[PDB]
Design a protein around this ligand. Structure first.
Ligand SMILES: [Mg+2]
Ligand SMILES: [Mg+2]
Ligand SMILES: [Mg+2]
Ligand SMILES: [Mg+2]
Ligand SMILES: [Mg+2]
Ligand SMILES: [Mg+2]
Length: 153
RNA sequence: AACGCCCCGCCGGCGGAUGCCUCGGCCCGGGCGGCGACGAAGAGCGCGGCGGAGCGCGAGACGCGGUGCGGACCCGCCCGCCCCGAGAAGCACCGGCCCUCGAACGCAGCGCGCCCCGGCGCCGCCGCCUCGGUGCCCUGC
Protein backbone atom coordinates (compact mmCIF):
# COMPACT_ATOMS: atom_id res chain seq x y z
CA UNK A 1 0.00 0.00 0.00
CA UNK A 2 3.09 2.21 0.10
CA UNK A 3 3.49 4.45 -2.94
CA UNK A 4 7.18 5.04 -2.13
CA UNK A 5 9.88 2.60 -3.22
CA UNK A 6 13.65 2.89 -3.59
CA UNK A 7 17.01 1.27 -2.82
CA UNK A 8 17.86 3.61 0.07
CA UNK A 9 16.88 0.72 2.36
CA UNK A 10 17.68 2.91 5.40
CA UNK A 11 14.27 4.55 5.75
CA UNK A 12 11.70 4.38 8.50
CA UNK A 13 8.05 4.29 7.51
CA UNK A 14 4.59 4.43 9.04
CA UNK A 15 1.02 4.73 7.83
CA UNK A 16 -2.57 4.97 9.01
CA UNK A 17 -5.76 4.20 7.13
CA UNK A 18 -9.25 5.66 7.29
CA UNK A 19 -8.12 8.56 9.46
CA UNK A 20 -11.18 10.44 10.69
CA UNK A 21 -9.88 13.89 9.78
CA UNK A 22 -10.37 16.22 6.83
CA UNK A 23 -8.39 15.13 3.77
CA UNK A 24 -7.56 18.66 2.57
CA UNK A 25 -6.28 19.93 5.93
CA UNK A 26 -4.15 16.80 6.38
CA UNK A 27 -2.74 17.13 2.87
CA UNK A 28 -1.70 20.70 3.63
CA UNK A 29 -0.06 19.75 6.93
CA UNK A 30 1.92 16.88 5.38
CA UNK A 31 3.06 19.02 2.46
CA UNK A 32 4.15 21.72 4.91
CA UNK A 33 6.26 19.33 6.98
CA UNK A 34 8.12 17.85 4.00
CA UNK A 35 11.86 18.39 3.65
CA UNK A 36 12.41 19.31 7.31
CA UNK A 37 14.62 17.69 9.89
CA UNK A 38 12.62 15.68 12.38
CA UNK A 39 13.46 17.83 15.41
CA UNK A 40 12.53 21.01 13.54
CA UNK A 41 9.34 19.30 12.35
CA UNK A 42 8.28 18.50 15.91
CA UNK A 43 9.01 22.06 17.02
CA UNK A 44 7.05 23.45 14.06
CA UNK A 45 4.02 21.24 14.69
CA UNK A 46 3.92 22.16 18.37
CA UNK A 47 4.16 25.84 17.42
CA UNK A 48 1.23 25.45 15.02
CA UNK A 49 -0.70 23.90 17.90
CA UNK A 50 -0.82 27.26 19.73
CA UNK A 51 -0.94 29.75 16.86
CA UNK A 52 2.74 30.69 16.81
CA UNK A 53 3.31 29.39 13.27
CA UNK A 54 0.96 28.77 10.36
CA UNK A 55 0.31 26.04 7.79
CA UNK A 56 0.40 27.52 4.26
CA UNK A 57 -2.27 26.33 1.84
CA UNK A 58 -1.09 25.73 -1.72
CA UNK A 59 -3.88 23.52 -3.07
CA UNK A 60 -7.28 23.93 -1.35
CA UNK A 61 -7.47 27.63 -0.54
CA UNK A 62 -10.71 29.12 -1.87
CA UNK A 63 -12.11 30.31 1.44
CA UNK A 64 -8.85 30.43 3.41
CA UNK A 65 -8.07 33.89 4.73
CA UNK A 66 -4.96 36.04 4.57
CA UNK A 67 -2.80 36.28 7.69
CA UNK A 68 0.49 37.96 8.53
CA UNK A 69 2.16 34.80 9.86
CA UNK A 70 2.18 33.49 6.27
CA UNK A 71 4.42 36.31 5.02
CA UNK A 72 7.53 35.02 3.29
CA UNK A 73 6.33 31.50 2.44
CA UNK A 74 5.24 31.84 -1.19
CA UNK A 75 1.54 32.34 -0.45
CA UNK A 76 -0.52 34.71 1.68
CA UNK A 77 -3.02 32.07 2.88
CA UNK A 78 -2.89 29.64 5.78
CA UNK A 79 -4.72 28.19 8.75
CA UNK A 80 -4.14 26.35 12.03
CA UNK A 81 -5.67 22.85 11.77
CA UNK A 82 -5.43 20.94 15.06
CA UNK A 83 -6.88 17.49 14.32
CA UNK A 84 -4.51 17.12 11.38
CA UNK A 85 -1.57 18.23 13.49
CA UNK A 86 -2.31 15.66 16.20
CA UNK A 87 -2.65 12.84 13.66
CA UNK A 88 0.51 13.80 11.77
CA UNK A 89 2.51 14.05 14.99
CA UNK A 90 1.46 10.52 15.92
CA UNK A 91 2.45 9.07 12.55
CA UNK A 92 5.77 10.93 12.48
CA UNK A 93 6.67 9.68 15.96
CA UNK A 94 5.98 6.10 14.88
CA UNK A 95 8.11 6.45 11.74
CA UNK A 96 11.02 7.93 13.69
CA UNK A 97 10.87 5.08 16.19
CA UNK A 98 10.84 2.53 13.37
CA UNK A 99 13.89 4.12 11.73
CA UNK A 100 15.94 4.49 14.91
CA UNK A 101 15.43 0.96 16.22
CA UNK A 102 15.64 -0.94 12.92
CA UNK A 103 18.73 0.82 11.53
CA UNK A 104 20.13 2.08 14.87
CA UNK A 105 20.29 5.58 13.36
CA UNK A 106 20.25 8.67 15.55
CA UNK A 107 17.62 11.41 15.36
CA UNK A 108 19.94 14.26 14.30
CA UNK A 109 20.43 12.98 10.72
CA UNK A 110 16.84 12.00 9.88
CA UNK A 111 14.74 14.01 7.43
CA UNK A 112 11.18 13.85 6.13
CA UNK A 113 11.77 12.70 2.57
CA UNK A 114 8.36 11.56 1.30
CA UNK A 115 4.63 11.65 2.00
CA UNK A 116 1.37 10.65 0.36
CA UNK A 117 -2.26 11.41 1.24
CA UNK A 118 -5.12 9.61 -0.50
CA UNK A 119 -8.89 9.97 -0.30
CA UNK A 120 -10.92 7.31 1.50
CA UNK A 121 -14.57 6.27 1.79
CA UNK A 122 -16.51 8.06 4.52
CA UNK A 123 -19.58 7.61 6.69
CA UNK A 124 -22.92 8.74 5.27
CA UNK A 125 -25.52 10.69 7.23
CA UNK A 126 -28.52 12.68 6.00
CA UNK A 127 -29.92 16.17 6.39
CA UNK A 128 -33.43 17.54 5.91
CA UNK A 129 -34.35 20.33 3.52
CA UNK A 130 -37.37 22.48 2.74
CA UNK A 131 -40.48 21.09 1.04
CA UNK A 132 -39.84 17.57 2.31
CA UNK A 133 -36.47 16.89 0.66
CA UNK A 134 -33.49 14.90 1.94
CA UNK A 135 -29.80 15.49 1.15
CA UNK A 136 -26.50 13.81 2.02
CA UNK A 137 -24.09 14.72 4.82
CA UNK A 138 -20.91 12.70 4.29
CA UNK A 139 -17.36 13.02 5.61
CA UNK A 140 -14.03 13.13 3.75
CA UNK A 141 -11.41 10.87 5.40
CA UNK A 142 -7.93 9.97 4.13
CA UNK A 143 -5.01 7.54 4.17
CA UNK A 144 -1.63 8.89 5.31
CA UNK A 145 1.94 7.62 4.95
CA UNK A 146 5.21 9.26 6.01
CA UNK A 147 8.81 8.29 5.22
CA UNK A 148 11.94 9.42 7.09
CA UNK A 149 15.44 8.99 5.72
CA UNK A 150 19.00 10.27 5.64
CA UNK A 151 18.79 13.30 3.40
CA UNK A 152 17.24 14.43 0.10
CA UNK A 153 20.60 14.68 -1.66
C1' A B 1 9.33 33.89 -11.62
C1' A B 2 7.01 30.76 -8.17
C1' C B 3 2.46 28.54 -7.25
C1' G B 4 -2.09 26.99 -9.11
C1' C B 5 -4.05 24.78 -13.77
C1' C B 6 -3.45 21.59 -17.96
C1' C B 7 -0.26 17.45 -20.76
C1' C B 8 4.30 12.18 -20.22
C1' G B 9 7.25 7.76 -17.64
C1' C B 10 6.81 4.88 -12.76
C1' C B 11 3.96 3.92 -7.99
C1' G B 12 -0.77 4.39 -4.97
C1' G B 13 -6.27 5.27 -4.17
C1' C B 14 -11.75 5.21 -5.53
C1' G B 15 -15.11 2.31 -8.20
C1' G B 16 -16.81 -1.89 -10.11
C1' A B 17 -17.04 -3.02 -15.98
C1' U B 18 -14.96 -7.16 -18.53
C1' G B 19 -13.63 -12.51 -18.86
C1' C B 20 -14.39 -17.20 -16.88
C1' C B 21 -17.82 -19.97 -13.63
C1' U B 22 -22.88 -21.09 -11.64
C1' C B 23 -27.36 -26.74 -6.58
C1' G B 24 -31.24 -20.88 -10.48
C1' G B 25 -34.76 -19.57 -14.48
C1' C B 26 -37.59 -20.37 -19.24
C1' C B 27 -39.67 -23.53 -23.07
C1' C B 28 -41.25 -28.59 -25.04
C1' G B 29 -42.91 -33.76 -23.96
C1' G B 30 -44.80 -37.50 -20.54
C1' G B 31 -47.47 -38.95 -16.04
C1' C B 32 -50.92 -37.81 -12.39
C1' G B 33 -55.51 -35.94 -11.42
C1' G B 34 -55.66 -37.33 -4.82
C1' C B 35 -59.16 -31.99 -0.03
C1' G B 36 -63.39 -31.27 3.85
C1' A B 37 -68.30 -31.66 10.08
C1' C B 38 -63.80 -38.68 10.98
C1' G B 39 -63.14 -30.70 11.11
C1' A B 40 -60.21 -28.86 5.11
C1' A B 41 -57.38 -24.59 2.86
C1' G B 42 -55.73 -20.57 5.77
C1' A B 43 -54.29 -17.71 10.36
C1' G B 44 -52.50 -17.13 15.52
C1' C B 45 -49.63 -18.75 19.66
C1' G B 46 -46.20 -22.24 21.54
C1' C B 47 -42.17 -26.47 21.37
C1' G B 48 -34.74 -27.31 21.11
C1' G B 49 -29.25 -28.71 26.78
C1' C B 50 -26.84 -23.89 25.46
C1' G B 51 -32.06 -21.30 20.36
C1' G B 52 -33.07 -15.20 16.78
C1' A B 53 -35.11 -15.96 11.35
C1' G B 54 -36.62 -20.33 8.04
C1' C B 55 -38.12 -25.75 7.96
C1' G B 56 -40.58 -29.07 11.08
C1' C B 57 -43.79 -30.26 14.88
C1' G B 58 -48.45 -29.58 18.79
C1' A B 59 -48.67 -29.60 26.22
C1' G B 60 -46.90 -37.16 24.02
C1' A B 61 -44.53 -30.36 20.72
C1' C B 62 -37.12 -29.05 16.81
C1' G B 63 -41.11 -35.38 17.93
C1' C B 64 -43.60 -40.97 20.23
C1' G B 65 -44.52 -46.34 18.73
C1' G B 66 -44.52 -50.94 15.08
C1' U B 67 -42.55 -53.65 10.86
C1' G B 68 -38.54 -54.08 7.22
C1' C B 69 -33.73 -52.24 5.11
C1' G B 70 -28.89 -49.83 6.60
C1' G B 71 -24.31 -50.43 9.42
C1' A B 72 -20.56 -45.96 12.48
C1' C B 73 -21.20 -41.77 13.47
C1' C B 74 -23.42 -37.52 15.63
C1' C B 75 -22.22 -29.43 11.38
C1' G B 76 -19.90 -25.93 17.46
C1' C B 77 -19.29 -27.30 22.92
C1' C B 78 -21.44 -31.28 25.27
C1' C B 79 -24.13 -35.89 25.85
C1' G B 80 -24.54 -40.55 23.56
C1' C B 81 -23.31 -45.19 20.52
C1' C B 82 -19.03 -48.94 20.02
C1' C B 83 -19.36 -55.98 20.69
C1' C B 84 -21.38 -61.58 15.29
C1' G B 85 -26.14 -57.43 17.13
C1' A B 86 -25.47 -55.05 21.56
C1' G B 87 -27.12 -50.35 16.98
C1' A B 88 -25.12 -43.76 15.30
C1' A B 89 -26.50 -41.34 10.57
C1' G B 90 -30.14 -42.50 6.73
C1' C B 91 -34.76 -44.77 3.93
C1' A B 92 -39.94 -46.89 3.17
C1' C B 93 -44.64 -48.06 4.87
C1' C B 94 -48.15 -48.45 9.00
C1' G B 95 -50.45 -46.74 14.27
C1' G B 96 -51.33 -42.81 17.37
C1' C B 97 -50.91 -37.61 19.76
C1' C B 98 -52.96 -33.22 17.57
C1' C B 99 -53.48 -25.85 21.90
C1' U B 100 -56.93 -21.05 19.96
C1' C B 101 -59.51 -19.03 15.56
C1' G B 102 -61.37 -20.68 10.82
C1' A B 103 -67.34 -23.90 6.43
C1' A B 104 -66.67 -23.24 12.46
C1' C B 105 -71.44 -25.69 15.72
C1' G B 106 -74.40 -23.46 23.74
C1' C B 107 -74.03 -17.36 23.28
C1' A B 108 -69.80 -13.96 22.60
C1' G B 109 -64.65 -12.98 21.34
C1' C B 110 -61.47 -13.49 25.38
C1' G B 111 -66.32 -12.49 28.60
C1' C B 112 -70.87 -15.50 30.24
C1' G B 113 -74.91 -19.14 30.49
C1' C B 114 -78.69 -23.53 30.66
C1' C B 115 -78.81 -28.42 32.40
C1' C B 116 -80.90 -33.11 36.78
C1' C B 117 -77.66 -37.32 35.91
C1' G B 118 -73.78 -35.15 30.24
C1' G B 119 -74.27 -32.62 27.49
C1' C B 120 -76.30 -28.30 24.91
C1' G B 121 -75.75 -25.14 16.29
C1' C B 122 -78.56 -25.13 11.34
C1' C B 123 -81.09 -27.38 6.94
C1' G B 124 -82.84 -32.10 4.55
C1' C B 125 -84.51 -37.52 3.95
C1' C B 126 -86.33 -41.90 6.34
C1' G B 127 -88.45 -43.95 10.85
C1' C B 128 -90.52 -43.55 15.61
C1' C B 129 -92.86 -41.00 20.11
C1' U B 130 -96.23 -37.11 21.92
C1' C B 131 -100.11 -33.89 20.19
C1' G B 132 -103.71 -29.93 17.32
C1' G B 133 -108.04 -28.89 13.75
C1' U B 134 -116.54 -25.47 13.99
C1' G B 135 -111.25 -30.68 7.58
C1' C B 136 -114.28 -35.46 5.93
C1' C B 137 -116.82 -39.02 8.80
C1' C B 138 -118.56 -42.24 12.65
C1' U B 139 -120.14 -43.90 17.25
C1' G B 140 -121.81 -43.43 21.85
C1' C B 141 -124.06 -38.98 25.12
MG1 LIG C 1 -16.19 31.51 -3.98
MG1 LIG D 1 -33.38 21.52 7.04
MG1 LIG E 1 -42.89 16.95 5.60
MG1 LIG F 1 -36.85 -19.78 15.21
MG1 LIG G 1 -65.77 -22.50 18.64
MG1 LIG H 1 -70.01 -18.32 17.18
Amino acid sequence: KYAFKSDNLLVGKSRRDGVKASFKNTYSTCRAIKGMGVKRAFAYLDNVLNHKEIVPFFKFYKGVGRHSQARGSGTDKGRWPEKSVVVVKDILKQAVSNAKHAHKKEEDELYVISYCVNRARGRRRRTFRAHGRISKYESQPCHVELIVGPKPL
